[PDB]
Design a protein around this ligand. Structure first.
Ligand SMILES: [Mg+2]
Ligand SMILES: [Mg+2]
Ligand SMILES: [Mg+2]
Ligand SMILES: [Mg+2]
Ligand SMILES: [Mg+2]
Ligand SMILES: [Mg+2]
Ligand SMILES: [Mg+2]
Ligand SMILES: [Mg+2]
Ligand SMILES: [Mg+2]
Ligand SMILES: [Mg+2]
Ligand SMILES: [Mg+2]
Ligand SMILES: [Mg+2]
Ligand SMILES: [Mg+2]
Ligand SMILES: [Mg+2]
Ligand SMILES: [Mg+2]
Ligand SMILES: [Mg+2]
Ligand SMILES: [Mg+2]
Ligand SMILES: [Mg+2]
Ligand SMILES: [Mg+2]
Ligand SMILES: [Mg+2]
Ligand SMILES: [Mg+2]
Ligand SMILES: [Mg+2]
Ligand SMILES: [Mg+2]
Ligand SMILES: [Mg+2]
Ligand SMILES: [Mg+2]
Ligand SMILES: [Mg+2]
Lengths: 258, 123, 144, 187
RNA sequence: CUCUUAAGGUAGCCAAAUGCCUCGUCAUCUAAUUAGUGACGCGCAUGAAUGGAUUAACGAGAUUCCCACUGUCCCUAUCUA
RNA sequence: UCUAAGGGUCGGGUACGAUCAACUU
RNA sequence: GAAUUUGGACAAACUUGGUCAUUUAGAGGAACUAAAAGUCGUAACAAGGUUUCCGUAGGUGAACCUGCGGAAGGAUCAUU
RNA sequence: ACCCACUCGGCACCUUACGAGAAAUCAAAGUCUUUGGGUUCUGGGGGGAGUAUGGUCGCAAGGCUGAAACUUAAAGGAAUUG
RNA sequence: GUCGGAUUUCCAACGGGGCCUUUCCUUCUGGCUAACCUUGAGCUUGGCGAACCAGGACUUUUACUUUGAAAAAAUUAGAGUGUUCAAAGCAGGCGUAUUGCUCGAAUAUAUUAGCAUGGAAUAAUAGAAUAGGACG
RNA sequence: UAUCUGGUUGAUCCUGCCAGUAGUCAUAUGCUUGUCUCAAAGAUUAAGCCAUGCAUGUCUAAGUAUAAGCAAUUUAUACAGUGAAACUGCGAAUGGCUCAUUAAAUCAGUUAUCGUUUAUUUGAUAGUUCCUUUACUACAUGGUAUAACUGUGGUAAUUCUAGAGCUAAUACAUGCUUAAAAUCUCGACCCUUUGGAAGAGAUGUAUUUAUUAGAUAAAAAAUCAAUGUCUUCGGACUCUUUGAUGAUUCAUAAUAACUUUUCGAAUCGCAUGGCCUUGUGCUGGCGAUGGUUCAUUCAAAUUUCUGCCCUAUCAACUUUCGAUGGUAGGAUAGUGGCCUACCAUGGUUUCAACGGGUAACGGGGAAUAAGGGUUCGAUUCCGGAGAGGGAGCCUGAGAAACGGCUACCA
């Protein structure tokens, strides 16, 4: 009321941050940034609660004011900068590179990537229309705009961005039989080799999807991210590859080693 | 404003106040387990009940239901692990008929007596 | 309908930004603008070769059908360019394990391209608020 | 002040809605400008999100487009002559959108002679070669020639002076012109 | 219970235009009320076509209070024919 | 100082136009 | 460019009425419940000493009585 | 018009209790804890009370609709023995 | 057939799918032409489009029920785990503890309404009767 | 953990209620009280009234310091060290608290914005502005005022302020500085038919109006109006450029103009480098702040379908002066009877409208439960509303703000 809210209570933050209900009334409210608040890492959560690299928010604040942490190759000193899907976190100390990829469980899992891998990223194209002076542009899922794109790029494809220049090297067309990554939804964090899609004019287009173990699931079109042609993807998949093991037999795998 | 602290009572009272039958029996239970009051028995009755409420839930479900198999083995794993349930009885129907005191048998003060070294339960 | 003797209001009735130029001569003396509403609804022949204006018409006006698509039976057509339809449904009362009849009145704007009567079963499409209470627009007539 | 909410006037069933939610600024209105003619005076309005809005009063002149020739010029206004909404606006010579006005028609007359050169109402060879090419088009209509004799053209204000501070429009032609002339001359 | 009539005033109604005592008693209206109204009823001497009890409407009928208004008054003064 | 409404009479091969005059609101 | 000012809409608030709702006084009248070994009867329960009850109307200290029509919950399941 | 046999509908009746019920008793008052054919109306301890008030109908008598305060642990039904 | 864990040719049951028994239970512009009468010497040159696609005129309407997607977190049910037990909490656990390794923080419920999908029994609607009925 | 028991009679079997029985993130209270962990808490009546004290301020390398501040840099004579006050820029619209109002209202789930505003974050994004645009002219950069401060004073007092004298900018107000190219309008002449010219102007973005494009299932011929690029004037003829959505008058572009005219950097820190005709000559890095527009993010506004407690001793309500709809306009950030003018007579209801009550904020949820249910939800999260009652409004992207203002009542 009367204007935007600026706090975030605990028990309101998105559940995939794994924030314990006790230990403080409030939670870090992500600032405006390249990604939606609801699906957002922000760094005070990443550095302190996931990597255990800092014990308080004040040490997390100290690390950022050394210009060490850089997201997508830019410093981003802000403590609540919303880190989103498939941003690359590079730390000069320990020469460690991270990518934000949802685990099989739908949480932002710690995922170390090779230094060569941290040299590009993928973004799902959300809209492609003409800008001023008749200059076509695209919009990726992280708000990045790219002028003068390949005309063959259409909505729902994905593009490979250099991350040093705002340019694109490659794009994967959206077709049945392409490897995808479900972002958002009850099947969040699964990889599934599109089988087909339905039109359903009037909105909310669905797509059917089946993983390697021949398990079929369907999610909405906005919740699908093509990650390259079938077989090899263009990014290093985390451990597990999003298979969604049932609770029944996962324990046996858990009890396999002990 | 802080997250509310979950709490729950660990005991339930019997419906009818004065049974000669129930009054005698529970008093016997404290006799050979050295329990201070009736609350140490009501708790075991309450613990056993929420065991059966879950145990009854699984049985009425279809056999080979993924819920029953996973959870059913989970319950008998814990009951066996403590020692309340004998190893030879793992059918999830032998949980339904366990006993009142099998939990009281695995209490430390009882087990210390069993493992010598006390020569009386009140010791 | 009766073509409502189109030029009747105080202000001249015309389709906005649809200019006919008198310097040249050709067929189709008065240019007419129309569109297809999508969702499979067809543009009726009357709208194409009519003479009405009805700037709220979903085929020749400045309104767009988006959102819910409904269906009901016309119960009162005493308005002007508007009708009220009745939508019946059974509301399930959980305690008694059975249903009860209910109904609602949805005042919908009816285009001049359509002719409707009491008892006609019509489908309507949602659009931006047309009047104090009109939010749907007659888009297909299924009975006569 | 003037509020555009609807938690006032009655619900559809005729029931009266009780008071709720003391007036909000994002549901306001303001008062009409009622832009008159002459002695230009425009006041600025600070609207939502900044977005300055210009409120015309006592405006002088405007930009009117003669649609057929694809041109526009700056001309004056003689007065309001017909208003579909409220006849009271006519008597006070009040400028609103779609209020039929008479404009000065002076620049149009010289432009027509500059462009066509044949005649209206009633030197170097570089000129008439254009005129020879720009021929067969000096027969615009017989109902606008008669207006040029008096030097006033029936124009319609197609702009919102209350919002943009400007009175722009077009010159009535063809069917639209014949619609208002019969309304004007009826007696 | 008694004496006694042709029969012993019923339903109603009342200090009423009928109530002597009386300026009856209680309440209300009032600063203050022999006035008014509502109640009461052993009613000198109410009461049934001697018509009884009520009654909307109507009244140059009798009475009481209130608002508006006012030289009726406080308290007189001036003007015209 | 204006405005709206309220009429008569004449007119198409087998919707409109012209003329006149009312006090009522 | 201040004081001041014309007109407009928003409009608090007051005064005077009106309406509705809730509390509440009141001479007097008329009910209902309770206690107390009050006074008068004895209408009901037995064929309750005139069988009982219903509707209606009238009357009488009071329970009630009387007419007309009903019912049996009757004091008859019954007269080839 | 009678007699015999049969049938459709009605007014009833006689014996039985497989069944029902608290029981008197019921061929429906059965097919209801082995509880569901469709449907309308009514009831929720006894008094206050079918009262007050308000509507509405009536010439009136009165009808229909209809409380609350308060007070109480029993009122009641069917049979048994006296 | 390995020493209580699974395979095969199996006698059965349980439930699906395809074809035929008069059983179109809609289709064109073009692609894969596909499953290809395609056969080239026992792996070869060419069969009919949804088995996958853009637009097609049409398109009987419901109710129901299955599956699926959404239904904040806390709370409820509940998996794991030493808070000394427990109420709790989401921790921790293992190393030669010198340089470190590593699992978790599941799952379910979530009336009714809305959306997509399969069934078409049950309960309703309509169609070709002074035939503008369908094929042509 | 699918359980009942005492009370109508001399006794019996029923109807039926009274009593007991058990629980309560349901309160109070009585008697008693040793330990550990955990934790509600002036909500219920009074959304009654409040002494006092706190609860909103804020700086870096990076806007402005002659403190007549503090110490010494000493690399500095203008400054560059720290740094009160004050200007400027942000914030004070969050949080916190309460639950009075509120019964299709809020709210929950689900849609829409092809119906709008959005500070901020993130990503992109101005060669077109010497206006008679060859001396108008500063572009190695252009004016004004004021605070802080010095001094004089008033008042009993307020976070009161007057007059006088100074001084700054990322305060305020102005203001030029860079290529072309092409296009279209005008338009000197040869003079002519097939006609081209010298020369000039305009051509950013922003606002407003108008007009044009924003196609796109299939193949061939007839002669025309005249060739139409080049001709072997026979005609080979193609390139003919065109994005998205279910859908648009969409995106975007083109022509004509309009504007009282927006924006298009007179700003700051750090490191100082290369080029020579070594002149304070020409170029050069890393940042900070601001800035038009588009997109994203944080939002907001409005909006769809369905869903709410007791009431008929509430059966008709709405339309005087908006009730339901049409047209036009004004207003708004935008749709809309939101408002106004004209016109029509509509709109809801026995499927319960309207009116009344609520010891009613809605939900997520809570207690008790065999299954079904009943009752509660002021209160740890989400949503709304309020700041003693009403009303209006300034600043701002955002308030109908009240630890802002104005007025009225108390
Ligand atoms: Mg933040
Ligand atoms: Mg007696
Ligand atoms: Mg006696
Ligand atoms: Mg009797
Ligand atoms: Mg009886
Ligand atoms: Mg008979
Ligand atoms: Mg009861
Ligand atoms: Mg009762
Ligand atoms: Mg008896
Ligand atoms: Mg359905
Ligand atoms: Mg049915
Ligand atoms: Mg009894
Ligand atoms: Mg007795
Ligand atoms: Mg007894
Ligand atoms: Mg009780
Ligand atoms: Mg708040
Ligand atoms: Mg930015
Ligand atoms: Mg309108
Ligand atoms: Mg409008
Ligand atoms: Mg309340
Ligand atoms: Mg409350
Ligand atoms: Mg809250
Ligand atoms: Mg407020
Ligand atoms: Mg207060
Ligand atoms: Mg306020
Ligand atoms: Mg305060």
């Amino acid at each position: 009321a009367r204007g935007p809210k600026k706090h975030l209570k605990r028990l309101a933050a998105p559940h995939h941050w794994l924030l314990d209900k006790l230990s403080g009334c409030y939670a870090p409210r992500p600032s405006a940034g390249p990604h939606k608040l609801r699906e957002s890492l922000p760094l005070i959560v990443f550095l302190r609660n996931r990597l255990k690299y800092a014990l308080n928010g004040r040490e997390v604040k100290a690390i950022l004011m050394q210009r060490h942490v850089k997201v997508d190759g830019k410093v981003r000193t802000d403590t609540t900068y919303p880190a989103g899907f498939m941003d690359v976190i590079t730390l000069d100390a320990t020469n460690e590179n991270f990518r934000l990829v949802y685990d099989v469980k739908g949480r932002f899992a710690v995922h170390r990537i090779t230094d060569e891998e941290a040299s590009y990223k993928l973004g799902k194209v959300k809209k492609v229309q003409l800008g001023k002076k008749g200059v076509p542009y695209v919009v990726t899922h992280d708000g990045r705009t790219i002028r003068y794109p390949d005309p063959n790029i259409k909505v729902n494809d994905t593009v490979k961005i250099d991350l040093a220049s705002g340019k694109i090297t490659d794009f994967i067309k959206f077709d049945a039989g392409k490897l995808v990554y479900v972002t958002g939804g009850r099947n969040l964090g699964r990889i599934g080799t599109i089988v087909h899609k339905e039109r359903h004019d009037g909105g909310f287009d669905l797509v059917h999807i089946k993983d390697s173990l021949d398990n079929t699931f369907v999610t909405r079109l906005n919740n699908v991210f093509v990650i390259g042609e079938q077989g090899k993807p263009y990014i290093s998949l985390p451990k597990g590859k999003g298979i969604k093991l049932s609770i029944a037999e996962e324990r046996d795998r858990r009890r396999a080693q002990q | 404003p802080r997250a509310p602290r979950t709490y729950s009572k660990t005991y339930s009272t019997p419906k009818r106040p004065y049974e000669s039958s129930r009054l005698d029996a529970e008093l016997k239970l404290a006799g050979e387990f050295g329990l201070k009051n009736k609350k140490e028995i009501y708790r075991i009755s309450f613990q056993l009940s929420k065991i059966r409420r879950a145990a009854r839930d699984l049985l009425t479900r279809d056999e080979k239901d993924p819920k029953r198999l996973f959870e059913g083995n989970a319950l008998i794993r814990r009951l066996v692990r403590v020692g309340v349930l004998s190893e030879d009885k793992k059918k999830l129907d032998y949980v339904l008929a366990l006993k009142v005191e099998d939990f009281l048998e695995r209490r430390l003060q009882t087990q210390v007596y069993k493992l010598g070294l006390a020569k009386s339960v009140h010791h | 309908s009766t073509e409502l003797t189109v030029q009747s209001e105080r202000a001249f009735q015309k389709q906005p930004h649809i200019f006919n130029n008198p310097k040249v001569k050709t067929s189709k003396r008065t240019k007419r603008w129309y569109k297809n509403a999508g969702l499979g609804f067809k543009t009726p022949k009357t709208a194409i070769e009519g003479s009405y204006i009805d700037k709220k018409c979903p085929f020749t006006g400045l309104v767009s059908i988006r959102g819910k698509i409904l269906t009901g039976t016309v119960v009162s057509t005493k308005m002007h360019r508007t009708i009220v339809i009745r939508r019946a449904y059974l509301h399930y009362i959980p305690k008694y394990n059975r249903y009860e009849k209910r109904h609602k009145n949805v005042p919908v704007h009816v285009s001049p391209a359509f002719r409707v009567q009491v008892g006609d079963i019509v489908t309507v499409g949602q659009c931006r608020p047309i009047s104090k209470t009109v939010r749907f627009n007659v888009v297909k007539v299924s009975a006569a | 002040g003037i509020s555009r909410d609807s938690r006032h006037k009655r619900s559809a069933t005729g029931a009266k809605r009780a008071q709720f939610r003391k007036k909000r600024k994002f549901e306001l209105g303001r008062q009409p400008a009622n832009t008159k003619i002459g002695a230009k005076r425009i006041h600025s309005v600070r609207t939502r999100g900044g977005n300055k809005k210009y409120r015309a009063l006592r405006i002088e002149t405007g930009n009117f487009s003669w649609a057929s020739e694809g041109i526009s010029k700056k001309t004056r206004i003689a007065g309001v002559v017909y208003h579909p909404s409220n006849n009271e606006l006519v008597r006070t010579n009040t400028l609103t959108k779609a209020a039929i006005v008479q404009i000065d028609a002076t620049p149009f007359r010289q432009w027509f002679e500059a462009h066509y050169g044949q005649t209206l109402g009633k030197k170097s060879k570089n000129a008439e070669r254009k005129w020879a090419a720009r021929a067969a088009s000096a027969k615009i209509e017989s109902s606008v020639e008669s207006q040029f004799s008096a030097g006033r053209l029936y124009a319609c204000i197609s702009s919102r002076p209350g919002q943009s501070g400007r009175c722009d429009g077009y010159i009535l032609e063809g069917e639209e012109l014949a619609f208002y002339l019969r309304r004007l001359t009826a007696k």
